[PDB]
Amino acid sequence: MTVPDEPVGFWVESIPGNDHTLRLRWSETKGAKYYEIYLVSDSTYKFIASTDKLEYYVTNLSPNTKYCFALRAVNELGPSNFVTASSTTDRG
After folding, report:
1. Which residue range forms the structural domain that includes residue 26?
2. Are 69 and 37 in contact (CB under 8 A)?
3. Distances (CA, A) of 2 to 50, 68, 70, 78
4. Considering only CA atoms, which of 74, 75, 87 is closest in space to residue 16?
5. How far is the C-alpha of 11 from the C-alpha of 85, rounded, in Å?
6. What count of other Cβ atoms lies within 10 Å of the Cβ of residue 91?
7. Contacts 24+ apart (CB under 8 A), 33-36
8. With helix as H, strand as E and coil as C, how does 32-88 read?
9. Per the database record, which ranges form the Fibronectin type-III domain (predicted)?
10. N or C: which end of the chain has fewer CB within 10 A?
11. How many structural domains is the chain composed of?
12. Contact 75, 31 (CB under 8 A)
């Protein structure tokens, strides 16, 4: 078997009225047992969370700030490549 497919449809969306949260969403992914989410900052990745959901709310962000995330799917053989998406938190 292989590492999972790369996820598709990875979108990061703002939450109007919430200046400290972004909503991450992605499609179910062939071969995936779970997904890992990272914050991409100045060309380095910071771990956020592992989940078997298809969406995740990243809380405790600063207002009016663009965040880029990297998402990958994982199984027992290893991880998929990353897909990326970004958005800006509400101004508050």
Report:
1. 1-92
2. yes
3. 20, 27, 20, 8
4. 87
5. 6
6. 10
7. 33/4, 33/73, 33/74, 33/75, 33/76, 34/73, 34/74, 35/7, 35/71, 35/72, 35/73, 35/74, 36/71, 36/72, 36/74, 36/79
8. CCEEEEEEEECCEEEEEEEECCCEEEECCCCCCCEEEEEEEEEECCEECCCEEEEEE
9. 6-91
10. N
11. 1
12. yes
Which two tokens mark 8?
């598709």
Distance between CA 77 and CA 85 in Å, rounded?
Answer: 25
The conformation of residue 6, written as its DSSP 8-state character, comes to P
For tokens 């709310």, the residue is: 57
Residue with the two structure tokens 């995936």: 32
Technique employed here was X-ray
The angstrom resolution of this structure is: 1.9
* Residue entry with tokens 């199984």: 75
